[PDB]
Nucleic acid binder design. Structure first.
Ligand SMILES: *C(=O)[C@H](CCSC)NC=O
Ligand SMILES: [Mg+2]
Ligand SMILES: [Mg+2]
Ligand SMILES: [Mg+2]
Ligand SMILES: [Mg+2]
Ligand SMILES: [Mg+2]
Ligand SMILES: [Mg+2]
Ligand SMILES: [Mg+2]
Ligand SMILES: [Mg+2]
Ligand SMILES: [Mg+2]
Ligand SMILES: [Mg+2]
Ligand SMILES: [Mg+2]
Ligand SMILES: [Mg+2]
Ligand SMILES: [Mg+2]
Lengths: 66, 50, 136, 116, 177, 75, 75
RNA sequence: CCGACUUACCAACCCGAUGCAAACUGCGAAUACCGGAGAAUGUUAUCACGGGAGACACACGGCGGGUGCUAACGUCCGUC
RNA sequence: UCCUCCUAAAGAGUAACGGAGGAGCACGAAGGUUGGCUAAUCCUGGUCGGACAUCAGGAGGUUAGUGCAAUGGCAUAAGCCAGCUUGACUGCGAGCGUGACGGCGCGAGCAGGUGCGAAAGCAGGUCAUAGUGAUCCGGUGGUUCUGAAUGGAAGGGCCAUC
RNA sequence: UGCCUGGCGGCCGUAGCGCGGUGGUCCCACCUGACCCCAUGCCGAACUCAGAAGUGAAACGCCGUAGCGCCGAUGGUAGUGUGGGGUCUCCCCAUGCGAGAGUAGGGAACUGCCAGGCA
RNA sequence: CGCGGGGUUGAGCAGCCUGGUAGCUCGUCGGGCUCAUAACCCGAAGAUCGUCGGUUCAAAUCCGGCCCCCGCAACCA
């Protein structure tokens, strides 16, 4: 490095809402809590559940009260 | 044309001067170069005047 | 007509015309009109002879024009004294040496290409001859 | 590449030494050893050669290829050349920066009796 | 670092068995990560280039180098020497740390997650990627931000084949398709 | 340049105004009698049999030579 | 629009190979550096190769790029 | 939007073949020219200094060329 | 008037109201030295971003670059960055090139004092060739050289310069 | 003496590209780490320091192969010096010099001074 | 194509005089006034500064090329 021209880089312990303790270094200095990381991300079900809107056939049939 | 003449009078005390041309638009301040003064035979500072 | 679309310089020296030619063999077609004389040959005599070639076959066969003018020829106007500059470019000529195969055609019977070349050989200012392709 | 870009970095001062007709002390520096040799002005035949790959300087040194090792080989050539009658040379850099173990080679050779 | 030791422990074995190598120094490994932003316009707001460099430095704790126009291209009214973008090259510990802290928390924060394409290769085994915005990194706190400036990340590895470059990043749990 | 006008503030005002206005009127006269002369020089000086009748005026435009006018610093 | 030219500069080799030159004598007046300075010759700011020690000129071809070099024999 | 299609039409860079150039050269003479050694020949034919000049309107013919119309007993150069 | 190419006939030179382009500058760094660096142009991958801005890899090889027109050059770079600096020195100069002359150009080395570099070394302006005008007359500065009886002085000379 | 490697040259494509293979005891390269001697218009990537755990992958060296690059006859052709001639804007004869391109082919270097390791 | 001039909103003209600002008169469009047109009052519209280039941080202005139009000239015995 080049003698204090970079932003300060120190170890922080950023945790997720699902626990997920990680020992990382970042130029924040204040601990951060955020949403689910890729350690527990729905990367296999977050797409299979995305298709939910569409199809008025069943909406018509549920309106078939007569 | 635009670059006109100046003279670098000697600051060793004697009457001696080199001659040069200087662009007076870009540089508004004097010239300060160490140049050989043959009357005293040593390298002194040479300010500009006219 | 024919003309260099672009030229590096406007006018060119008169120069000379010596030695034999380099395009001496029929290489594209099968019958060619080989020059036998010498002397510059204009760009109006290229088209006035190609028009006779394309009219005698009437549709048949490709034809190749194996020569290109690319040589400006100046000419002082009338009633003007000499000097006071060079002339004005008027036309373009192709310096032709003996042996230079001018035209060649292909796909037609020999006895018909002989007649098409003979009709086009009468619009040119240099002696020509008929030559057929060889195997070398 | 690092050796083509270093031989190019050396061709400037190599040729000036040739046209001045000067016997030159040429160094080659390796992460494992360091070599030095005095070369005749024609540049073809060598006179003095000493390096840390030599089994006469290998065991005296704790490790070949540091500033301490370069200092020892510096005294090797300087004494070797003096017994051969060569007192003036020119330090050929070979493209290596005159900064580290290369500098310690010249300093030991210069102080030991060689003049450049 | 953490990902460095993960690599040297297990990914070496994984790739060795998957590609029947015979030497340790033959397995592809990541060599550098270069992340840049070409701010496009700094001639108008010369300070916006400074702010973009500040954003990149916040994202990765290294002062960016300001890369200037190479040739005076006439299309966008620039000439030689104009500052055009900023760039950071990360190697070693900083490389590994940024790689880990990207792939763990920065990637999932993209809106409408899909998984990064597998055809984003130059043909020599080096990966490239966009982000479309920089807020997804934990280093921007919605205060100084005025634009939605993004990054362009190139992970350059010593892989000598596109397939090997695929496998190297696949073995690291990359969000692929 | 500093040129000293004796008097008072109003005296300087009237003096400066009057002198500048007379200069910008001398300029008008010189411009008029230069443009008229140059018209004749352009008409003649290429005629085949009357060419030498523009050269008594080509040398006279060279003698009017309107004086240098420098932009006023007021703005 | 034409008719302008410059006085000839009198370039070219002055002392050809085999000539016994004195010291400091000009050998080649050049414009670029077509002949490179070899042994016992110099190169002025004008690129004019001049003998640096008397002897006999020698033209030779050497170097990676087949350059033309001028030397001198110490005779 | 996507280009969804279609082109009888044009077409750069490249690949193979054929040409041209005073202001093109990855090639390249004959002559000419500079320097050195050697005989024969030539009333020094060479150089330098000094006294006296004349001359600076050239013409044609062969060769190499500009301009001209590869016209002129035309015009401008190089060499005999 | 000066510079570059061709005519110019492979040493130098060579004309026309022959064919083509430029000059009447710029620069206290665009000079010196030391250290470092290497282009154009297309191919693949990516946020805006597209034929072309920035980034990464490869092919290419100087087809880029040079303050300014052309030719000759340049990788050891003469092309691109950075540190320190004023040799953009004073007196000379063996020996040459080119001029009818006036003059113009190249220059190793010597003496005095510097600069860069560890040192060998390089530096008397810039990659080179254009960017310029003689003499007379007069101006400014220095200088016991002279000073019309003698001491001064005016006025001449000499050096730098307009 | 023999082989391999390293440095400095000679010589400069018959000597350089491309394809296949090969070498780690010594040597070379990659390589581990870096507060520090030093460095990055940011980055120990480059420069530099301390040392050896691993590999010969990359590079490099070496060997084999003609797919390129490269070299290249003999004969003829063009040109031309001197002397003659023609139907003379172009040529021919005697004689001296004699290319360029292309063809058959050659061809993936040779060598010197030191210093190591194993012979 | 030998010497000058200008090309700016629909028409005729300033702005080019030493780079930052696209304007004036009439005209076109929509309202109001009037029995209706004209005149008159209110509001807005439109122009790649002839066209391609170069220094420029910027151009219309400065420079260069190309086209269009408007004036002179192309001699005597
Ligand atoms: C003009 O040239 C004509 C010539 C005839 S005189 C013998 N007349 C002159 O007066
Ligand atoms: Mg006379
Ligand atoms: Mg005469
Ligand atoms: Mg004559
Ligand atoms: Mg005559
Ligand atoms: Mg006559
Ligand atoms: Mg000549
Ligand atoms: Mg000649
Ligand atoms: Mg320069
Ligand atoms: Mg250097
Ligand atoms: Mg320089
Ligand atoms: Mg120059
Ligand atoms: Mg007296
Ligand atoms: Mg006096």
């Amino acid at each position: 490095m080049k003698k204090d021209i970079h932003p300060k880089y120190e170890e922080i312990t950023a945790s997720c809402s699902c626990g997920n303790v990680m020992k990382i270094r970042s130029t924040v200095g204040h601990d951060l809590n955020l949403d689910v990381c890729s350690k527990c991300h729905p990367f296999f079900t977050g797409k299979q559940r995305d298709v939910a809107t569409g199809g008025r056939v069943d909406r018509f049939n549920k309106r078939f009260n007569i | 044309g635009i670059r006109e003449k100046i003279k670098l009078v000697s600051s060793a005390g004697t009457g001696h001067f080199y001659t040069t041309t200087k662009n007076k638009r870009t540089k508004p301040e004097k010239l300060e170069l160490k140049k050989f003064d043959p009357v005293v035979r040593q390298h002194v500072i040479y300010k500009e005047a006219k | 007509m024919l003309q260099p679309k672009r030229t590096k310089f406007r006018k060119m020296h008169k120069g000379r015309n010596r030695g034999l030619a380099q395009g001496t063999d029929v290489s594209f077609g099968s019958f060619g009109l080989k020059a036998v004389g010498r002397g510059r040959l204009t760009a109006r005599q290229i088209e006035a002879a190609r028009r006779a070639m394309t009219r005698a076959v009437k549709r048949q066969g490709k034809i190749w024009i194996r020569v290109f003018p690319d040589k400006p020829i100046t000419e002082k106007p009338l009633a003007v004294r000499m000097g006071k500059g060079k002339g004005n470019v008027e036309y373009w000529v192709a310096l032709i040496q003996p042996g230079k195969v001018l035209y060649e055609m292909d796909g037609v019977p020999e006895e018909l290409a002989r007649e098409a070349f003979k009709l086009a050989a009468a619009k040119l200012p240099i002696k020509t001859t008929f030559v057929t392709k060889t195997v070398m | 590449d690092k050796k083509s870009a270093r031989i190019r970095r050396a061709t400037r001062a190599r040729r000036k030494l040739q046209e001045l007709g000067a016997t030159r002390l040429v160094v080659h520096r390796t992460p494992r050893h360091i070599y030095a040799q005095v070369i005749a002005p024609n540049g073809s035949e060598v006179l003095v050669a000493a390096s840390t790959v030599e089994k006469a300087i290998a065991e005296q040194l704790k490790y070949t290829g540091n500033k301490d090792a370069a200092a020892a080989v510096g005294k090797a050539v300087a004494e070797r050349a003096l017994e051969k009658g060569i007192k003036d040379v020119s330090f050929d850099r070979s493209g290596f920066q005159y900064h580290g173990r290369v500098q310690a080679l010249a300093d030991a050779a210069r102080e030991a009796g060689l003049q450049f | 670092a953490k990902l460095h030791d993960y690599y040297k422990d297990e990914v070496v074995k994984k790739l060795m068995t998957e590609f029947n190598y015979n030497s340790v120094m033959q397995v592809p490994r990541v060599e550098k990560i270069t992340l840049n932003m070409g701010v496009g316009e700094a001639i108008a707001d010369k300070k916006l280039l400074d702010n973009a460099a500040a954003d990149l430095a916040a994202i990765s704790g290294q002062k960016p180098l300001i890369t200037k126009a190479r040739k005076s291209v006439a299309g966008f009214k620039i000439r030689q020497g104009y500052p055009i973008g900023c760039k950071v090259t990360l190697r070693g510990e900083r490389m590994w740390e940024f790689f880990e802290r990207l792939i763990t928390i920065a990637v999932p924060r993209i809106r409408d997650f899909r998984g990064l394409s597998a055809k984003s290769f130059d043909g020599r085994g080096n990966y490239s990627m966009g982000v479309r915005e920089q807020i997804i990194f934990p280093e921007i706190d919605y205060d100084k931000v005025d634009r939605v400036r993004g990054l362009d990340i190139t992970i350059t590895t010593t892989a000598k084949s596109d397939e090997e470059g695929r496998a190297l990043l696949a073995a690291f749990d990359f969000p692929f398709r | 340049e500093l040129r000293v006008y004796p008097g008072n503030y109003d005296e300087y005002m009237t003096a400066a105004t009057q002198a500048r206005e007379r200069l910008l009127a001398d300029n008008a006269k010189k411009k008029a009698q230069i443009a008229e002369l140059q018209s004749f020089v352009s008409r003649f000086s290429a005629n085949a049999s009357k060419s030498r009748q523009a050269t008594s005026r080509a040398r006279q435009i060279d003698k009017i030579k309107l004086e240098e006018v420098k932009a006023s610093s007021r703005q | 629009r034409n008719g302008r030219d410059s006085e000839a500069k009198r370039l070219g080799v002055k002392r050809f190979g085999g000539e016994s030159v004195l010291a400091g004598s000009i050998i080649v007046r050049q414009r670029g550096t077509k002949f490179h300075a070899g042994a016992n010759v110099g190169c002025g700011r004008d690129h004019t190769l001049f003998a640096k020690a008397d002897g006999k000129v020698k033209f030779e071809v050497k170097g990676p790029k087949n350059r033309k070099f001028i030397s001198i024999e110490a005779e």
